[PDB]
Amino acid sequence: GTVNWSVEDIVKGINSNNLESQLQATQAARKLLSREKQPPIDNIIRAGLIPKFVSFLGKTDCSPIQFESAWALTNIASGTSEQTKAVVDGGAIPAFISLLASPHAHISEQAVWALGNIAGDGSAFRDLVIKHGAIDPLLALLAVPDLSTLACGYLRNLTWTLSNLCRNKNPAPPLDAVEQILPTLVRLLHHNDPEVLADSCWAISYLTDGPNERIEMVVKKGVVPQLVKLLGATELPIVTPALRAIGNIVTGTDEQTQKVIDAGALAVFPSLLTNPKTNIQKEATWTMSNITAGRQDQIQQVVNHGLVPFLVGVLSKADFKTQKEAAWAITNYTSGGTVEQIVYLVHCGIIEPLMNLLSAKDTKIIQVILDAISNIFQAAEKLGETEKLSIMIEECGGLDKIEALQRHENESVYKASLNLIEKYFS
């Protein structure tokens, strides 16, 4: 029927003045574009078919050709930037926004999908979709008393497209667009579908990846407890964006960070800092490093929750990039912590895994670790216990590492190494 048409035949049918001939040719184009291996997107673009597809979007009296061209344009728009641009250049954005109000659910869903692809290209096309007025019709489709009455696949497509309207950072989405979208996002964050939840958290993670004012717009909508709950989900596609969102929020103020602590997030971190997926461990340790960069009462909550032994853990054994986040977590801890808090670090065994990491060739992690050691020695000076710590560093081979680092190509590796030796290893 419409399987395995040549492009030349598709053009012949679309160029006839017979709507039914154009419908069959358009469906055949859709089927070509739907195959997984190397769909002839450029061949379809080169044949001048995009203006015709866009024109078919407006044929209200023939909804099948609206659907077939919507699907075809969706798949062209799903390619490279140049391929998405060709769809935009053909006038597709307002035609797709007009289809959002279609009485045919499968047609409006396809328009939702298509706009998601166009917005997904980047901030310029994202903001152009916003300027054409897409947000109001999109949100109207979710203005129902109970989300559960909407078709699952429909709801997932709306959520995903909304997440693209929140994505990308230079520039971030318009402030008023984010405010318009947020209450619907909050509602989707409480839905029970795992895919809606994953994409909802992805959207929140994009919105919190910016300055503190962007974080605050999200935080004051009250989503932090729900994010913490999703942090404990069994589905890793939910935990990853939830954790990215939580970690983003703790890059903000101590007040915004405190709301993460208040919501009970630290109790999840024994699992996160031992999580088998290496990227979860990295994100969780980075998150921890920004919490230990906070106030002393926030460092105390890390201590209370038993998380210092888990930092000793990842410092002792983890992927290197996670180990460097753990080094940062320690140095931040030692910069803001009390004497008692810093002494507790030593009691948990931080010193030897810290010393072993001075074997690394990463120059910045060596600077990080030497800053931590200096801060710990400063805590030892206020107690008259500098030498008990020097023998501890010497007994685990740490002194041999600090002494060797005086011959390092960076000129503050040495200049911190020799000062440590000059002052504490006389």
Binding site: S34, S78, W113, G116, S163
Partner: peptide, 10 residues
């Protein structure tokens, strides 16, 4: 996991 664009095979 979070692709910017999605192709429709259906």
């Amino acid at each position: 996991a979070n692709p910017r664009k999605r192709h429709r095979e259906d």
